[PDB]
Paper text:
[name] splicing is executed by the spliceosome, which undergoes an ordered process of assembly and activation prior to catalysis. The A complex associates with the U4/U6.U5 tri-snRNP to generate the pre-B complex. The pre-B complex undergoes RNP remodeling to become the B complex, which is converted into the activated spliceosome (Bact complex). In this study, we report the cryo-electron microscopy (cryo-EM) structures of the entire human pre-B complex at an average resolution of 5.7 Å and the human B complex at 3.8 Å.
Following two rounds of multi-reference three-dimensional (3D) classification, 186,161 particles yielded a reconstruction of the entire human pre-B complex at an average resolution of 5.7 Å on the basis of the FSC value 0.143. The human pre-B complex comprises U1 snRNP, U2 snRNP, and the centrally located U4/U6.U5 tri-snRNP, which are loosely bound together to yield a highly asymmetric and dynamic assembly. The tri-snRNP has the appearance of an irregular tetrahedron, with its four corners corresponding to the U4 Sm ring, the U5 Sm ring, the U6 LSm ring, and Brr2. U2 snRNP is held on one edge of the tetrahedron between the U4 Sm ring and the U6 LSm ring, whereas U1 snRNP is positioned along the neighboring edge between the U4 and U5 Sm rings. Neither U5 nor U6 snRNA directly engages the [name] in the pre-B complex. In the pre-B complex, the small protein Dim1 directly interacts with the tip of the U5 loop I, which remains unoccupied. Sad1 bridges the interaction between the RT Fingers/Palm of Prp8 and the PWI domain of Brr2. In the pre-B complex, Brr2 is connected to the core of the tri-snRNP through three patches of direct interactions: between its NC and the Jab1 domain of Prp8, between its NC and the convex side of three tetratricopeptide repeats (TPR) of Prp6 (residues 272–373), and between its PWI domain and Sad1.
Numbering used by the authors:
A (entry chain A): 224 to 284, 292 to 445
B (entry chain e): 4 to 81
C (entry chain C): 112 to 158, 173 to 943
D (entry chain f): 7 to 48, 65 to 86
E (entry chain W): 103 to 565
F (entry chain A): 1113 to 1168
Amino acid sequence: TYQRWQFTLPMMSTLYRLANQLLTDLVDDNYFYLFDLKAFFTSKALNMAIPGGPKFEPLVRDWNEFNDINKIIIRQPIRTEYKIAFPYLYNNLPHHVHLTWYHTPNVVFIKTEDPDLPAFYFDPLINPISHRHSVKSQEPLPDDDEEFELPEFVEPFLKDTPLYTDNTANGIALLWAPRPFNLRSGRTRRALDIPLVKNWYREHCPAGQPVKVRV
Amino acid sequence: GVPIKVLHEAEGHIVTCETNTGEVYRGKLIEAEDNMNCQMSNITVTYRDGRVAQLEQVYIRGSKIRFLILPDMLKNAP
Amino acid sequence: TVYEMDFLADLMDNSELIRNVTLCGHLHHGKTCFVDCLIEQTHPEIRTEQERGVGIKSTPVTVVLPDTKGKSYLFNIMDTPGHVNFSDEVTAGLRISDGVVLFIDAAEGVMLNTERLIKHAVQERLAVTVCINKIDRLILELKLPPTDAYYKLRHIVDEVNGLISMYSTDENLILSPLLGNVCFSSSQYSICFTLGSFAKIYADTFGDINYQEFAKRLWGDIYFNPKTRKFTKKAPTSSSQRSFVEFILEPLYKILAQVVGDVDTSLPRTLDELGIHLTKEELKLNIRPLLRLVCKKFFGEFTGFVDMCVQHIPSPKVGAKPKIEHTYTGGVDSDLGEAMSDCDPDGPLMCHTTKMYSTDDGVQFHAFGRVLSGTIHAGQPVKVLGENYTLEDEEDSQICTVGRLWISVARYHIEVNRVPAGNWVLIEGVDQPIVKTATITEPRGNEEAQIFRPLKFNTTSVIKIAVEPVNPSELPKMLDGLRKVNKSYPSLTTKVEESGEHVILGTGELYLDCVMHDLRKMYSEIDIKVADPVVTFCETVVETSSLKCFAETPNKKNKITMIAEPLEKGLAEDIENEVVQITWNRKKLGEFFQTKYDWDLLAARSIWAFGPDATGPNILVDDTLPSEVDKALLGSVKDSIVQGFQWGTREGPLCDELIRNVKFKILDAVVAQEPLHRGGGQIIPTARRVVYSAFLMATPRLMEPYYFVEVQAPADCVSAVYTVLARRRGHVTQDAPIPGSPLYTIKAFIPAIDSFGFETDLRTHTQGQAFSLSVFHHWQIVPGDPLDKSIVIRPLEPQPAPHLAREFMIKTRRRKGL
Amino acid sequence: SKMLQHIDYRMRCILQDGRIFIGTFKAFDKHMNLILCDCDEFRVLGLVLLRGENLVSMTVEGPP
Amino acid sequence: RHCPYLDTINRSVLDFDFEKLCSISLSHINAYACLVCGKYFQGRGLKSHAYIHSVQFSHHVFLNLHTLKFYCLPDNYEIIDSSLEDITYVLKPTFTKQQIANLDKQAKLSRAYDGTTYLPGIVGLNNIKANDYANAVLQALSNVPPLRNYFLEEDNYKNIKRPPGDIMFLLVQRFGELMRKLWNPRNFKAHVSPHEMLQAVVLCSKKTFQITKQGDGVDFLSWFLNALHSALGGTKKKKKTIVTDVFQGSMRIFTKKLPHPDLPAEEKEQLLHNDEYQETMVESTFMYLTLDLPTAPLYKDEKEQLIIPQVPLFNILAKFNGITEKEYKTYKENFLKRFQLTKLPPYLIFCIKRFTKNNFFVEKNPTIVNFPITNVDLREYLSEEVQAVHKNTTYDLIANIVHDGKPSEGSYRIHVLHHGTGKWYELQDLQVTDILPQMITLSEAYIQIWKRRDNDETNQQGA
Amino acid sequence: YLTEHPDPNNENIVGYNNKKCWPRDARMRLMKHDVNLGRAVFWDIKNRLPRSVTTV
Ligand SMILES: Nc1nc2c(ncn2[C@@H]2O[C@H](COP(=O)(O)OP(=O)(O)OP(=O)(O)O)[C@@H](O)[C@H]2O)c(=O)[nH]1
Ligand SMILES: [Mg+2]
């Protein structure tokens, strides 16, 4: 019936790399900070066009005090990105408005170009802990070199297993893959949807173009 | 198990301990060793002669305890 | 749910097995996910914030979790949002809680809000325990070596200890792995462990060896010799990794590496050694899920955090002695303070309301509070005391019956009949009576208890937004909405000006935006207009006035000669922190001032008041030969003058704002003898004028609030961050790489007005890599002079720095002062 | 084994001194330590835990 | 007891019938009226707009809107001994049963501060050009004696630190103060402003007073009656004092006792068939009885009236003469009908169907509705007196909403009987005028209240 | 005027007429002092005319 596949990771990682050119650069979701459906609903609702996003037909359809210029302090001028980001502060008469704004711990993805020895002794960044203080945090635990005989026949549980395995790197890589390749067993799907062009669709500001592409 | 989980689970709670010689000790157990030896604080001991002996701290041996009275409401088991 | 309720009631009754726990950690360090996982363990019954992905409001959870001993424990957990703007909820949580648990991300290291949370905890005298979340990041993201990981772990703990030592003069406690204060846990993969916890696991797997002794020598500069057997201080030249590494990090890496790395070839055998039993189905899962399951089976329930909480938490019994002095205005002495300390359900009992939790359906909301003494029964009528209410001020106070009591699991409401003191509880029916923080008291009882000090806020609210409903006729509805948000948020401060503009003061953009949104969709139906964000300002005078204007009252019974000059470099900051506060004795205070700042003894003697706030920037001083000659009358006149001076300082003589960093000094006092009601009534209005005049005479003062900004960013985008800051008038303080992680930290300052939209611009230019948090930190004089007629302001075009002061002054006045 | 059939049942425990304990059997151990609920001595002990060293006989005094 | 600042009090600048907010903070909490400028300020303490105002605007005597107390500042003390009984009474008028009988005044010509001279209950109201409908219902309900006397002397209701026997919520406390106000014999001006009551009834969701696109005397009367009965109610003082005698839509619900009795009637409809098919009876409780009004052409132009139809107006008299039930049971819907008024309530509201808002703006049903009944002997009495022409019960006209046809909205003026001078009294946007009771019907009637006498033969005999 | 027509809301201008024909900077500014004066003046004039003869 050819539904329900289960993948060997080695197979999956090999396929992924062959599809690597097609694959998007960035593992985290912070890149698409402004790539928000809520933003798009609000933009249409607020009739505001995001620099390089889609435009739309207008959804439906005067001296005032707050407008006055002499009472206005300007340090920075309220750019449209703010109006879309905070549309009930930036923008008046919001209706049916959702809360964009995703804040999360920074997403860091590690990959190594050359296999070397499984695992990495030091990070690419090479930030140094350089612990610095007094007597390197003196520890007064179990009476060392005295009554600490220890226990015979006991050992660390994970000592027998290797810290890294030939497929460890590949296993880790599959944690940050586009949706069909991050699951060993993933549901079978039809070709009805069409294409994998959305990553291409997701491009923000390519440059070196005619408008043709902006449309 | 019931002796272990309720033993160390009674730490800090009032409980009654009846020795093998008839010495009843009621108080808050500080800790319960895996050897069943326990230590109680502010425990009242009542001898066979009716003498009530209030002790600040008492350590009862595991083999010297005939039974123990656990608190009413707790779940080690149903 | 009834059986659980009975058990919960017994636990609550004990009051020693339940410890209130509050945890605060920098944005996204995992507090929320940890709580969610804990709830799942506790109740397998799995039935704006969610979409945003950022906690906007603090949530309280109560659960019972068995420890290693197995004795049941009652935990009240309040989760506080990581974001700095929404720090106010965290402050409320800290005040309610006995102890606070700190969460630090392993990869991120020490972060802005971590420091602030630690400082607040030290100031509030709550015991601090720290859990390191996202432990796996080094292993599975950074791919640091186990030795390297241990080095990085030592660093974070050392930094935290240093901060604690800095904040408190007395080093009662230091956080270290050996102590058990710090728990290494990763929320996502369900592994929470402490050296004690790990030792217990080892003991369970192995023969019976004593866990405590092994744990003590387990972590920090201890080397275990296999031949040696028992742990000993390092003596091998050959080099065996510190025993923390050898017994913990090594096996942790090996478990992770097998599961991600292999999972088919050798993963099963590793499991056999471990003794874990796996279904074929389970072994077909994706790696993250499979890894989490494996880790859960290996690490037990979630024991380390519970152990830490039971062990180093003072709980209800200790509770009040540290807490009441800060919290209760009496501070104990004769009755109420003593009663609170016992914590028994007897006599006065007591409640403290530090929060209001909104109901979707209606404006009324259920209040959350920590019952301090005695106990509360449903349907009892309880007196409510406002922050405003003091000793004999009955008019503010209101009394209403209690409709219902609830014990809160995450966003589930357990009704209960009664609640003993020392337990968090939601109170139905007290919503209308209480504004912001509140105290609940015996109703109609003689009792008499001073209200707990109102929340004191780590930040100062600065950003001002004007609000007006689109349709004028809907005004009262909007006003109602505003009331609701004042209850919902802690620091959120509203006001109505002379113009009539309705004003909201907030901490920053995200805070303000969320408040606006919440009001618009949940409190008031009406469409709301909004003005562009503007900062408040503060007024200070650069130099002393050569000539001092002396003004008589309506009836010329007296005259007042007063000068003004800017206070010393380290005066105002100390005055506010209460270091040299008015509470201290004249001899003590004067002497302290003189020693610290080389103050004159005579001038010290002459100090009368700190103006606008009991702790306030401004100082009032009396230095006249004449005053000494006829002091009797002088004291009374000084008191009235001080009240007038206080009024003058808050309002301002330019933008109608607060006056900052200014000393006002009386040189001549003229009061007609036996002035009676003349002096009493006329002097106050006069004094306000006098202050202003000296202010006019004593130079021009320029002010604007500044924000401290932490930017986390990759090396390649540092130039872009610098450029944005330069564009907005910022200036950078420090640019330094983060140890043990790849990334730079940029610390900078930036003018409040120029900060609007800064975050967004930074993120946009760096392609979502840099990220900025921003917090009010510092006042600083504006370049432009307060008064400059020769300066012409163009109506739209941004002005040059040389005369921003003029622009700000004029426009602010036009907004309201006129 | 046979310990699963007597779970959540009211048994009758006899000690070495001749004292009988009638209560609901809850949990036991490999050392034959009986934890009885609502036990009544032949004074109401209620919740109590009896050691297996002094145990003698365990009989069923009624339906569970 | 000259607290000398009492001299500074300006009675003539007070007006309690304004929204209860600080004018320079728009908070409701702890509002204090300055008695010298009549402006509201939130208060007591140092940095409070009331204290600051007392000193920058030299105005020391204040009144605590939400607590019945006066304060003299700058010290901040309470004026224990309060000759401001006058002032407190214009906040919060207070009555004892003697007063409601007392003079037989019935409505003795009061003075305001201006010496304008007006009959107590018989007062008009500001801004009729946005709340005229509301003012018509308020004056109807505050005329009905059991309802009115209940509110006027039920001083218990909703203080701060009241006992337990007393509370009902903000809606009822405010409608109580409106009623108190409109009977006040010592009003500082002749007329009152219910605009804040009305806006609080739209803005304060516990009333969704959220009716619009019609918004009449009928609709608002119904919405008020229903609300009062839900919001004073049984044991919760709102159905014992309401008066489940004073009407009785005797069918169902007995609610707040006074307005399920005290405004409902019961029409037992009685469907019939011939043969032996005993078709069925439907008692229905009803607070207001919708008259029809025969077949006015409406989509037909005019010179109207005497040159299309006025005179015989009276397709209408006691129109039904039993409604569907006695003579002209032209009961189109089904086999047989008669519609008996089988409970007959101590008042009886009629509401003339004047028109079908289902279609366009409305050509109404103008067909004049002649019951200026003139009949007592001792007559020229407008003796109203409607007697049941199958049974006897005998009822006297005592109110009469009029529609007027302003080129801008509508308008809705309200004509009340005054038993004791025997003088009908129009009010018409703060204006008042006496009207010849035989000429009442020459306006477009809209709503009448009809008191039951001969029940005052049960209570002519029951005194 | 305030005594004759006093409103808590001070909606007044809500209905206040102005000229849409001119640009915002040219069109009349809205102020309570200005708007209350406007309504007070209109009110004063309106009260000098009997409804039975004419009205405004
Ligand atoms: N590496 C790692 N990341 C985690 C773990 N648990 C949670 N996270 C991530 O950390 C981010 C924040 O976690 P949350 O618990 O949602 O944050 P929170 O504290 O609940 O909400 P804030 O208080 O606003 O931060 C999320 O993106 C999680 O995916 C973990 O065990 N390891
Ligand atoms: Mg959270």
